[PDB]
Amino acid sequence: PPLQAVLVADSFDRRFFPISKDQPRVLLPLANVALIDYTLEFLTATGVQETFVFCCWKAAQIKEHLLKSKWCRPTSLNVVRIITSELYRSLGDVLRDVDAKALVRSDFLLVYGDVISNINITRALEEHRLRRKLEKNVSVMTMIFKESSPSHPTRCHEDNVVVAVDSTTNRVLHFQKTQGLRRFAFPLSLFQGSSDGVEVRYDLLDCHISICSPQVAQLFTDNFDYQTRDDFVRGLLVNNQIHMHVTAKEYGARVSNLHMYSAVCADVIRRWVYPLTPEANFTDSTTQSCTHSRHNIYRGPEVSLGHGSILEENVLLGSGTVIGSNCFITNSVIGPGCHIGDNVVLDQTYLWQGVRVAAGAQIHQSLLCDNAEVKERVTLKPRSVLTSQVVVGPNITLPEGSVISLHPPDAEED
Amino acid sequence: VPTRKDYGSKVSLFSHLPQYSRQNSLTQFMSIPSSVIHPAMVRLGLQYSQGLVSGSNARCIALLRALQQVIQDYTTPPNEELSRDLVNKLKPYMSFLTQCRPLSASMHNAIKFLNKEITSVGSSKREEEAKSELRAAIDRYVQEKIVLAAQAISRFAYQKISNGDVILVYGCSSLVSRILQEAWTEGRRFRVVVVDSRPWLEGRHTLRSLVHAGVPASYLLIPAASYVLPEVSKVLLGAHALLANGSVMSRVGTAQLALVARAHNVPVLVCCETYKFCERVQTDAFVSNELDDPDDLQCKRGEHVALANWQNHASLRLLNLVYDVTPPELVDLVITELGMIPCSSVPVVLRVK
Amino acid sequence: GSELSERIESFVETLKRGGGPRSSEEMARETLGLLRQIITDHRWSNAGELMELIRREGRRMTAAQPSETTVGNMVRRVLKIIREEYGRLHGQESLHKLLTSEDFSFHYAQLQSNIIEAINELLVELEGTMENIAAQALEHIHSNEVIMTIGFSRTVEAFLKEAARKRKFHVIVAECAPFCQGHEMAVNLSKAGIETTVMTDAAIFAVMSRVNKVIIGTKTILANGALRAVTGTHTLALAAKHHSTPLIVCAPMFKLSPQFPNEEDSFHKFVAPEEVLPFTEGDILEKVSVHCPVFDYVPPELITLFISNIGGNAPSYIYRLMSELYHPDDHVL
Amino acid sequence: FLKEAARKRKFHVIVAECAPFCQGHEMAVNLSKAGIETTVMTDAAIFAVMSRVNKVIIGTKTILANGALRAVTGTHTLALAAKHHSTPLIVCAPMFKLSPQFPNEEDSFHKFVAPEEVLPFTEGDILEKVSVHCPVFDYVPPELITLFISNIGGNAPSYIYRLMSELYHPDDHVL
Amino acid sequence: MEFQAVVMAVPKPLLPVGNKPLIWYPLNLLERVGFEEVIVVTTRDVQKMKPDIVCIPDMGTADSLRYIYPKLKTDVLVLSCDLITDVALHEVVDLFRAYDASLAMLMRKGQRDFIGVDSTGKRLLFMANEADLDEELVIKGSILQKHPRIRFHTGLVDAHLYCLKKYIVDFLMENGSITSIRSELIPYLVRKLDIYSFIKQVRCYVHIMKEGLCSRVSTLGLYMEANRQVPKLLSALC
């Protein structure tokens, strides 16, 4: 049977609210490429032949970006079907609508609109199909995990989970979030079935990828109170089984907040998601061509680097850029068509398309969205966010954690 | 004490070297309360066999501490002199330790120094006084041969490091790490390129040691050394022993790195103390080396292991070398606690002391 | 027909995404077949339009993967073949031509047919190349000889297994650290009883004093006789030059690229750092730069001989062979 | 050295006989009498088989003050061939073969014997117009030597200058 | 020397197992591996290597180990009188010598207690009893941060074979609030005045055989099973 996928584009949360009220989260440029493009590339690379993209919040922009993409071309092997509806509220509603329309016919894929990964789900799919052949209707869902470390920058945030899995047959017996928990509590019934091998895993990075069965949509339709996948997993274990699969030589991560975005971008620029690299140009576009150079230096066409400037570490320079003299750019990504002044020091920054920076600025660990302008003698402290069309005046030093947009009540106004 | 058994089929070129297995040990055929061998010596041999102490100065320090404990627990029998009795008693311990793992040059020098110190004990000296004096001599040796000898080398190597340098290191070395940390603490600003190799992968012991200090460090494997060398300013290498002919005996990936560094006009620097100087000579890694566990070359690439069952193939041999020898013409500078001397002044230091 | 379009797109994505044909011979064969299907399933009045479309296809194929030079080599070979056929049916630069001295708009009917037949011969030559290198085994390997090889090469494997049925010698295989493919070659050689030994790269120099000859292969050969080999091969060449050990290269004719070593910063193939440093290291991965280059550059002065389907040659003659395979106007493609 | 290393090891030995004084045949017979798999060859083939030799071990008549050697003729060619293939060259010589003299006494360093060994007397009338020279010894530079084995152990040539200072007085160099 | 064997029998040690005394089985295990002298803490009626019998007037394991405190001078090897096994003793002390462990216990699989052994199978991280747990299992955060993988076992049988250091004996002697060390001290030692003041960290290791006798008799069924399967044990032993 042809492999299908369900791409939930609309992320029903407000983590990027100052940037979400202007454009959806699945259209934010990670490395000058949209996150939905990364997700579609990951889906097409593993063998998916049909994708159902559900868009609720700002569906027009996502729809036109998809029609302008490569996966919607007549020569593509992964058919993309944009199913937009205006009264979607959570992933449970999307799965209930899928069950109502009967779109899926076999074990499909469940991912979000922002999932950067190069995992090829064939071994996990074969295991999920073989396990469902022995048992009648067991193994309704198989979650994909990645071996990681509790100290890795990508695995230190809200998505920290702890599972109690059977080592003989990989099956999730417990699932909970460690948000603000000094100690974890596990029920004693877990040791009632096997009592031979039961291990508690804390080195699993949640990739938010699932190989599901058509029974998952039916269970979501039955239990109307189910909203997200975590609720379903937590409610199914207390009452069908849920298994898992762990990879150790592939990358997978879902962008959910700002620091997760930073870690994912730093991994993408450092070729950790190979072959998905900025120099590969997997989107097959003419405005995103680039050349790779030593120390992971990504140089686009006609960047016009100035004399005296130094590219020390992993940097990405888009097309149409122009950089002044005596600049120090490191560990940062610069969008296409930017104008940098002189004696500017950029470190761990993220400049989107159309950002203009005057001479004398010092930006460290800050995000500058589209059409952001910085005047002379401006210092941006780490974790400072500048949304679109924000022009910070001169001789002004922003504190740490400064978020300024055109809207009054988010954090601050222009 | 039963002799250790050989494991696997050794290479024809290295058929004169012992090859043991880490899984099997000799403690299976010994007393649980050790009688013939001292319990501290048995613990040290077990740690050497299991690889818990896998350094050069650490092995010497552990051996000297075990010897101090043995001397403290030593009691001279009647009708016998301590000078000969202790020397005759410490020989089976060294034989057992060699059976556990081939001794290093630092351990050999420490054993020789301790034997000389014990033989140089007077007859009229009391037992407790002689034991305390031997312990104090071992402590002074540890202090002025490893601790005090490292500060001088760190101070001598500080004036050779400049701002903006790209130092290339290899494997795990206490002296190199200490030198780099002290140079970064003094105020020198540079970056280090760490080179590693299978199967020990001990270079990661240095990498995470630099990140915790604040030095910008990079990581790569030894087959990709010719790619990063064009940007390397100088190469800092550690030495396990300096032979009397100027050759450097060190980790197997040292002479190769020194040879590839010569083709890129990169100066090669060697750091070693004067207590590791050997009066013997050696021209190749074939006459004297160490054959580690050949089962460490197995790696899981993809789904299966290509070397899962290598004993089934008769004509299949697995070579796992440990040490290698670098000729003196590939070494530019040797840093010791006496000063920055060339690689040809090794016998001179052997003659002065 | 659009079938050719689907085939071209599938081949482009198979080259760009991951690894398709896991052997250079099959890659060259499918490249030649796809070029033949393009020549047949397309309308071109004169040779100019055909050459232009073939050049565009080869350019996009090399843009899909720059390191896979076999596709570009086959494209340039097809271009040269078209050029000879056009020059023959119609009627290099040197000093003689510069002292004693053109467009493809003319149309010919049977020309295409001829071209096809020409491609045909090349096809058959492929299934000879490997054995055309293997049959020259006994001429370069004598009994009781120590031989060292690095990585996994089908050509060197066939060479050794053909030289072992009548001689008996010693073989040492140094496994590459990122991709330990030398273990597979070691097992395949030990399955034939050749007294094979396995070692790491760090010991390549250590045992270099007890090796009589080194025999290796490569991914492609440059125009000046240089090599684009697997990483760690430059160290092996340096060690062989230090001990004056002859270094033999087994490579067929479809591994000759007219390009010169001037495309730095893209010569080596960089893969994910997961092979060198694992992901489970911890928080140190955010301050450590890890690079894993797959290929490396080997200068021509460290090579002794080149064994190909035409026989044994010296590097100082490679410049001629290129001139006998490709046209100077097809170097940039 | 070879007959003591053969009672516990087994290796290959090749002996190149000198053309004027073919004394290598006697050593080859003495080695083959102990079962060491000895081979005999000429000097012209010294380079030809040099690619299949792991180590060269020789002796000498005397050692100069700078580490140089006064060996039998044809030894400089062997040292050059060993340096071309980076083959280690070991010298077995006791302590009484150290001379404080330096290579500055040319035209008398080599020992010249009658030309009867090179060209026989029964050649004819051509002996009156042909100059025949038969030098017995030759000079070997110190940079072509790897190690020196003596009764005190193994040393490098770059240390020979010290050993001389430990055996003779600077006022007795000219004697 | 290196160790000091102590066997407590508080009768059962005189039960005929193959027309032989029960306490004879540990004593035979103590021999054939050094141990030219042993300490025995038994009752008054329990009377018969160089055994050193000690007569005890409850008096569990802890207050009996601290009752012979002036007799112990080195590391202790505590066993029980009711124990029949074929284990190679070195396999336990190899975890006590190389790693310098504070505690080395021997256990086996049973053909209630939760044991959180780590991935390597030797280091002991978690050890709790079902009677002490109220409703669920509680695991600290730092333990899971340092060791992300903790394999739990519940069908294990304890052999009461413990190699302990001397400062642990000093702790048991100074603090008279611990009895039945197997149920009170071992979970306290795994939990990491305190013991740190007596040390002049704390590491606990566990060995498992899975293919041996390692049977500590405590009831009628275990006694009859030991009687039934001791024959070829003696055939391989005597």
Q: Please tell me what resolution, in angstroms, this structure has.
A: 2.6
Which residue shows structure tokens 């054993």?
B111
Element (H, E) at A173: strand A172-177
Number of domains in chain D: 1
Residue E20 CA to residue E80 CA, distance in Å, equals 17
Residue-range definition of the domain harbouring residue A138:
1-290
Q: Kindly list the distances between the CA atom of residue B275 and the CA atoms of A2, A366, B56, B278, B348, in Å, as whole numbers in the listed order.
A: 71, 53, 12, 8, 13
Residues 113-132 of B with CB under 8 A from E: none
Q: How many Cα atoms sit within 13 Å of B300 on the Cβ side?
A: 4
> Is position D117 within any domain?
yes
**Testing the interface with A: which of C279, C284, C288 to mutate, by most A Cβ within 10 A?**
C279
What element of type H or E holds A298? strand A297-299
Contact state of B260 with C179 under an 8 Å Cβ cutoff: no
Asked if residue E167 is part of any domain, the answer here is yes
Q: Which of C273, C280, C281 sits opposite A271 (nearest CB)?
A: C273
- Residues of chain C contacting residue B219, judged by C-beta atoms under 8 Å apart: 276-277, 288-290
| E2 vs B34, B46, B47: nearest CB | B34
Is A14 near chain C, with CB under 8 Å?
no
Residue pair D76/D139 in contact by the 8 Å Cβ criterion: yes
Which residue is it, tokens 């239990």?
A223
Q: A216 is written with which tokens? A: 């998952």
**Cβ contact (<8 Å) for C276 and B251?**
no
DSSP label at residue C86: H
Q: Does A312 touch chain C (CB under 8 A)?
A: no
Please report where in the chains the tokens 């050999």 appear, as a residue.
B108
Burial D79-100 (b: 16+ CB within 10 A, else e): bebbbebebbbbbebeeeebeb
| Cβ-based burial of B19 (10 A; exposed 0-12, middle 13-18, buried ≥19) | buried
Looking up tokens 């034997």 gives B115
The phi-psi region of residue A380 (left if phi > 0; otherwise alpha if psi is between -120 and 50; otherwise beta) is: beta
Method: cryo-EM
Q: Quick check: E13 and E46 in contact, CB under 8 A?
A: yes
Tell me, what DSSP letter sits at residue A254? E
CA distance E60 to D38: 80
- Three-state helix/strand/coil letters over chain E: CCEEEEEEECCHHHCCCCCCCCCHHHHHHHCCCCCCCEEEEECCCCCCCCEEEEECCCCCHHHHHCCCHHHCCCEEEEEECCCECCCCCHHHHHHHHCCCCCEEEEEEECCCCEEEEECCCCEEEEEECCCCCCCEEEEEHHHHHHCCEEEEECCEEEEEEEEECCHHHHHHHHCCCCCCHHHHHHHHHHCCCCHHHHCCCCCEEEEECCCCCCECCCCHHHHHHHHHHHHHHHHHHC
User: CB distance A183–E114 less than 8 Å?
Assistant: no
Question: What is the CATH number for D12?
Answer: 3.40.50.10470
Residue D43 lies in a domain: yes
Based on the domain organization, do A295 and A283 belong to the same domain? no
Contacts of C264-268 with CB under 8 Å at 24 or more apart are: C265/A291, C265/A292, C265/A293, C265/A294, C266/A291, C266/A292, C266/A293, C266/C66, C267/C228, C267/C295, C267/C297, C268/B227, C268/C231, C268/C293, C268/C294, C268/C295, C268/C296, C268/C297
Q: Which chains touch B (3 or more CB pairs under 8 A)?
A: C, D, E
Instruction: Find, among A404, A326, A318, the residue nearest to A368 by Cα.
Output: A404
- Is A151 near chain C, with CB under 8 Å? yes
Phi and psi at residue C162, to the nearest 5°: -85, -30
Q: Which chain B residues contact residue C179 at CB under 8 A?
A: 301
Tell me the three state secondary structure of residue D98.
strand
Show the domain range for E165.
4-200
> Last residue of some domain: A290, A309, A338?
A290
- Give a yes or no: residue E220 inside a domain: no
Q: Cβ distance D146 to D78 under 8 Å?
A: no
Query: E208 — phi, psi (to 5°)?
Result: -130, 140
Q: Identify each DSSP E strand in chain D by its residue range.
A: 13-16, 38-41, 56-58, 62-63, 69-72, 89-92, 137-140, 147-150, 153-155
3-class SS at A250? coil
Query: Is residue E155 included in any domain, yes or no?
Result: yes
> Does A398 share its domain with A358?
yes
Both tokens of residue E95? 């975890």
Is there a domain that residue D61 lies in? yes
**Amino acid sitting at position E39:** I
- Same domain, residue pair A278 and A349: no
Copy the structure tokens of residue C316. 């100082």
In 3-state terms, what secondary structure has residue D101? coil
Sign of CA dihedral E125, E129, E130, E134: negative
Out of A248, A266, A290, a domain closes at A290
Is the Cβ of E89 closer than 8 Å to some Cβ of chain B?
Answer: yes
Structural domain tally of chain A?
2
Tokens, residue A284: 């097959």
Q: Which two tokens stand for residue E88?
A: 């190679």
Phi, psi of A168 (to 5 degrees): -65, -60
Q: Choosing among B23, B28, B32, which should be mutated to test the E contact, i.e. which has the most E CBs within 10 A?
A: B32
Q: Are A114 and A209 in contact, with CB atoms under 8 Å apart?
A: no
Residues A304, A275 within the same domain: no
**Domain boundaries in chain B?**
1-152, 153-353
Using an 8 Å Cβ cutoff, are B327 and B265 in contact?
Answer: no
In a domain, D84, yes or no: yes
- Given A253, A275, A290, the domain boundary residue is A290
Give the rounded distance of the alpha carbon of C299 from its chain centre: 16
